[PDB]
Symmetry: D2
Subunit: 213 residues, 4 copies
């Protein structure tokens, strides 16, 4: 499963340990369908969250640095990110669509906003390449690159922390760009743990956007 986000971003599922029944086994402390689904709803509605820690996902995410900086604030998880030190990278940037400013009253037309952003990233990127060409080390030259540069990372996270992420990021108080990523994460979560996801929405989910879409 892969879902494209923004103009060049994505979220894709790399691996998963378990399914809804992994939470059921942990709660019962037993290795050996209505009953089980009812236990999931019961745990969720009574705040018994620790069984959900035994379901784990690994995602591969392509996102602009400003979005990754917000994302990497979630400390109960594991991350590995691309570094120019290890690997030569592709350099792509998030250019908002004009519809991103819809609902805002700007004195510049939205399409011109889009153009001004593309222009400044083109100039920044070209300054970077000239510095590289002239023998400036990469770790110094790259400091002129803008916050909308795309990066990629692996993210390994258990369902309990993932639910916290959805509470905070699949919510209208979160910035629009990361909301879009959170929606893709939720869609994958729902696919792999349908019972847990339905119970979370019904009983524990604190945000607004997953109830309207």
């Amino acid at each position: 499963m892969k879902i494209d986000i923004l103009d060049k971003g994505f979220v894709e599922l790399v691996d998963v340990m378990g399914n809804d029944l992994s939470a059921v086994r942990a709660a019962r402390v037993s290795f050996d369908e209505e009953r089980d689904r009812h236990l999931i709803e019961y745990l969720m509605k009574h705040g018994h969250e620790t069984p959900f820690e035994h379901i784990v996902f690994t995602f591969h995410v392509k996102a602009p640095i400003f979005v990754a900086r917000q994302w990497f604030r979630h400390r109960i998880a594991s991350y590995n990110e691309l570094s120019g030190a290890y690997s030569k990278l592709s350099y792509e940037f998030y250019i908002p669509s004009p519809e991103r400013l819809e609902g805002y009253k700007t004195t510049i037309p939205p399409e011109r906003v889009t153009e001004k952003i593309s222009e400044i990233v083109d100039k920044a990127y070209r300054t970077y390449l000239e510095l590289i060409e002239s023998g400036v080390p990469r770790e110094v030259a790259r400091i002129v690159l803008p916050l909308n540069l795309y990066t990629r990372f692996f993210w390994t996270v258990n369902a309990r922390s993932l639910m916290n992420f959805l509470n905070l990021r699949a919510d209208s108080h979160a910035q629009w760009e990361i909301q879009q990523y959170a929606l893709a994460i939720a869609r994958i979560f729902k696919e792999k743990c349908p019972w847990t996801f339905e119970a979370f929405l019904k009983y524990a989910y604190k945000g607004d956007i997953l109830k309207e879409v």
Copy 2:
């Protein structure tokens, strides 16, 4: 995979996410056996351990409470343990064998030590049952039960935290009982992640027992 430990304990593998290549994929943010095995060694040698967080195990453990108390000090992991509140329990107890007092200079035969331990355990257990029958709530009556009572738990842990656990517990400074569990944990780890386990022993393992066995 299930390994018997002590007189009634065990370590059982429940699930695993990933294998050695999960660490390699996360490190590169992406098979070539020679180069992949070499990367794993490189990471281990230079202390870049975050890629090993993307391998995850779930175990099912049966152990005495005094061993579990030591084990549960490892905070970077997930636990769910049996409680009498939700499950009726079997009541079994770890009685050391005379060989456990191999080469301790004692004034009483080792076999008699075993006998005295069995006696007091039996009497405590009888008392527990008398209190229960007489209407005392379980949460109060159980306070007479000794530290060698067996419990069971699920343990979900990533390879980085598992390696820390091995460093500290598969070691002669740890108590003999938890060493035996750690050896079983090491055996399962080695089976599922042979390249990581060998690199660990070669470059990062600080303990003194896993290179002996």
Copy 3:
């Protein structure tokens, strides 16, 4: 500041970093900004009401706690904290056990009088402790000998915990679903917290606290 709990237990405050204003400082950096008492106290309520918890991680406590192992076994489940505990492997354990009072059984139909429940618990404790001492005297290593001791043995530990994790602890343990014994420890923890961080504590009770017992102690 030391509060006695159960028959021989306690919670004692060892140290504290920060106060209510630590969280105000941390919150304000978001907007590139302390102000004054009314606005700063108002911010603490705002944060608590809207679920902004991270600013409270900058308030930290160290407690010294003496408690029965069955209580410590529950307490030590709180992983977002630091612990150091008395070792039964390394030290010779004192004759200190939690013997509940007869009132502990108030509310329960027993076929034995509660005073007799109390005496039966004491008897088994004494037999177990006697056995332990005799094993030790025979040269049985301490870490093996102690396995016969009951779960009501008292242990001691240091606990360092920030206010956000401490509030999670209060939600879960200052609550009627927790065992009565740990409730008593959580009431003491709450009293110390209220003493050092009155604004945070008050706003927590008013907007964020999910438990029941603190709203009426």
Copy 4:
């Protein structure tokens, strides 16, 4: 109180601290305070055998001003608490890290180092002015700021215990880390040394894995 300037406009400021060397001694001893010689000796013993949990009871709060590319590396340290200035919620000041010509010493460049410095300040100036224009035209801040470069300074509070701080030093007070973060780590180390002299000395002698604090 304690404040150390870093780079052209950055700093590390110590806001608060809980505990001292004796806090770790107290914490360790509960397993089994005495005098200064045996207590100093215990700290070295703990460091030597990798008994690190006692050091978690020593806690610092720092106030840090650093460029975003530095903060990006710093915030990978999960065993800590952060609160940071927001470009979504606040209008950002004209504060950017412009490296000095000396930052390029030992690298052979086809432009003089001086000109590299000028080229960097030019691109940041253009980027910042674009940001301001967008804000003035009514673009929300959270979108306007996406054109700003990685050398924009941010500010944050960092609360961290001595054990995690030693891990940070091992990794960042080290020649394999980027020069800019090394400079911050040197400042953290100087503060640590001042507040926990016995722990810091024991750390250097027995546990420190890096190469610049010596």
